[PDB]
Amino acid sequence: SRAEDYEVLYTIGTGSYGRCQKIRRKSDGKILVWKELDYGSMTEAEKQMLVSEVNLLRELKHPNIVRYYDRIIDRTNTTLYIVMEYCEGGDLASVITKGTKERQYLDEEFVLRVMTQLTLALKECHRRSRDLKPANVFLDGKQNVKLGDFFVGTPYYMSPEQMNRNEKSDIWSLGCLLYELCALMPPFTAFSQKELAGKIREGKFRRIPYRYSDELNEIITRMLNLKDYHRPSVEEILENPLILEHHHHHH
Numbered sequence: 513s514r515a516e517d518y519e520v521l522y523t524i525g526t527g528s529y530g531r532c533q534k535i536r537r538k539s540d541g542k543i544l545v546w547k548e549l550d551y552g553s554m555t556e557a558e559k560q561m562l563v564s565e566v567n568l569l570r571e572l573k574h575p576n577i578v579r580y581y582d583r584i585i586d587r588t589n590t591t592l593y594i595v596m597e598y599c600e601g602g603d604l605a606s607v608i609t610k611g612t613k614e615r616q617y618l619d620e621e622f623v624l625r626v627m628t629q630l631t632l633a634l635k636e637c638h639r640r641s642r643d644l645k646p647a648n649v650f651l652d653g654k655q656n657v658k659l660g661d662f663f664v665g666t667p668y669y670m671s672p673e674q675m676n677r678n679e680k681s682d683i684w685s686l687g688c689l690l691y692e693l694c695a696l697m698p699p700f701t702a703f704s705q706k707e708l709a710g711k712i713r714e715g716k717f718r719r720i721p722y723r724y725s726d727e728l729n730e731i732i733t734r735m736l737n738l739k740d741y742h743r744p745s746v747e748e749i750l751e752n753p754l755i756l757e758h759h760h761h762h763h
């Protein structure tokens with residue numbers, strides 16, 4: 513828990529909340545990442561909210577949730593580093609964008625992996641009481657899938673009930689994510705939120721591509737039911753004949 517315990521290899525990403533960098537723990541050479549945050553302009557109130565969230569971040573331990581490792585305060589530069597698991601396969605948004613640009617659909621086997629492992633990640637969250645967007649879902653080097661923590665944008669995954677302001681709402685969002693993985697587009701698209709909301713209320717969308725099994729289409733379609741109580745629970749999802757041991761995480 514000193515910055516000197518790690519060596520930065522290079523920057524992975526930049527943007528709103530400082531930099532994300534790939535680092536190496538000196539003690540044992542383990543490859544990790546950290547988020548570099550400048551809290552210099554923060555009030556005591558804001559810094560307080562920051563402390564509480566980092567504390568909860570330490571609470572979640574699960575193979576399908578991105579693991580938190582450490583927090584380092586550098587009062588000299590008013591920077592806080594949050595050290596997390598490195599996921600070499602990157603995020604799901606990059607995977608979809610890649611597929612969209614290259615014109616190549618993802619394997620059914622890969623979609624089943626994401627369905628199985630994200631459903632389990634969700635199952636864990638629901639127990640505790642965290643958006644299920646592709647940019648927040650990561651892949652490691654071993655076919656494992658991990659859920660990360662985290663106005664202009666279009667709310668593609670907004671559920672019907674949320675639209676008119678529920679664990680079943682999470683199932684809808686999972687539905688949209690799995691749909692987009694298969695179709696390389698969200699089930700409901702629009703140019704404005706008003707248009708989007710109209711489509712969501714009608715609850716109609718294209719079947720996922722024919723390369724995908726009727727069984728997989730069926731379960732995704734069920735998650736996209738207008739009525740929250742017709743959507744399958746995490747338990748009912750995991751009971752599906754499609755889902756097998758090899759779709760689960762492996763060390």
Ligand SMILES: CN1CCC(Oc2ccc3ncn(-c4cc(OCc5ccccc5C(F)(F)F)c(C(N)=O)s4)c3c2)CC1
Nearest residue numbers: 524525532545578597598599600602603606647660661662
């Ligand atoms: C090409 N482009 C694809 C995505 C990549 O970002 C990575 C790569 C490896 C990672 N190992 C753990 N993380 C986590 C990053 C994060 O928030 C930041 C983030 C989210 C989504 C896309 C990019 C980033 C970026 F800032 F790193 F760029 C996590 C969370 N909040 O739990 S976990 C990786 C992110 C590489 C660049």
Ligand SMILES: [Cl-]
Nearest residue numbers: 615616617696
């Ligand atoms: Cl295509």
Ligand SMILES: [Cl-]
Nearest residue numbers: 618619620621
């Ligand atoms: Cl396939």
